[PDB]
Design a protein around this ligand. Structure first.
Ligand SMILES: Nc1nc2c([nH]c(=O)n2[C@H]2C[C@H](O)[C@@H](COP(=O)(O)OP(=O)(O)OP(=O)(O)O)O2)c(=O)[nH]1
Ligand SMILES: OC[C@H]1O[C@@](CO)(O[C@H]2O[C@H](CO)[C@@H](O)[C@H](O)[C@H]2O)[C@@H](O)[C@@H]1O
Ligand SMILES: [Mn+2]
Ligand SMILES: [Mn+2]
Ligand SMILES: [Mn+2]
Length: 129
C-alpha cells in the first residue's frame, strides 16, 4: 500500500484564527478542509517540506515554527504520516495561491468533521491551547 510522509502548517494569527484551505473535488480527501501542506520529497527534511509547501500553496514562508503533532493514519487505500507544524510567525500574507479556496477560521469554531479524519486529535488539541 502507498506510504507517504506529509508536512502541513497550522497557520495561526494573533486573533486565534487559522488559515484553512479546501481540497479539490478530485483530490484524495476531496472537498475537505485542510491545513496547507503536502508530500515531503526525497532529499528534503520535514522542516524544509512545510516551508516549501506553504510557499507553493499559500505564498508565505513559515519561520520559528514548532512540531505540534506527528501521527500516522491508515486511509482505505494509503498510509500517511502527518507532520503538523504550528506556524505563528511568517513572511507574507496567505492566499489561494494555487487557485484554491482559503480563509481565516476561528480556532474555537473548527469542526473536525470538516477535515480528514486523521486531523481529529490535532483539532482537539488545538482547541486546548
Ligand atoms: N494538506 C493536507 N493534507 C492532509 C491533511 N490531513 C490529511 O489527512 N491529509 C492527507 C490528504 C492527502 O492524502 C495528504 C496530503 O497530500 P496533498 O494532496 O496535500 O499533497 P501535495 O500538496 O504534495 O499534492 P500535489 O501538490 O502533488 O497535488 O495528506 C491536512 O490537514 N492537510
Ligand atoms: O523542531 C522544532 C523545534 O526546534 C526549535 C528549537 O529547539 O526550533 C528550531 O526549529 C524550527 C523548525 O525548523 C525553526 O523554525 C526554528 O527557528 C528553530 O530554532 C523549537 O523552537 C521548536 O519547537
Ligand atoms: Mn501542495
Ligand atoms: Mn507537493
Ligand atoms: Mn497539498
Amino acid at each position: 500500500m502507498k506510504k507517504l510522509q506529509i508536512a502541513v502548517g497550522i497557520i495561526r494569527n494573533e486573533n486565534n484564527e487559522i488559515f484553512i484551505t479546501r481540497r479539490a473535488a478530485d483530490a484524495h480527501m476531496a472537498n475537505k478542509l485542510e491545513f496547507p501542506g503536502g508530500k515531503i520529497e526525497m532529499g528534503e527534511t520535514p522542516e524544509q517540506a512545510v516551508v516549501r509547501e506553504l510557499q507553493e500553496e499559500v505564498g508565505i514562508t513559515p519561520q520559528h515554527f514548532s512540531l505540534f503533532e506527528k501521527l500516522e493514519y491508515e486511509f482505505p487505500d494509503r498510509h500517511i504520516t502527518l507532520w503538523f507544524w504550528l506556524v505563528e510567525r511568517w513572511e507574507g500574507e496567505p492566499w489561494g495561491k494555487e487557485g484554491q479556496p482559503g480563509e481565516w477560521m476561528s480556532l474555537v469554531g473548527l469542526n473536525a468533521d470538516d477535515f480528514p479524519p486523521a486531523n481529529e486529535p490535532v483539532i482537539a488539541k488545538l482547541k486546548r491551547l
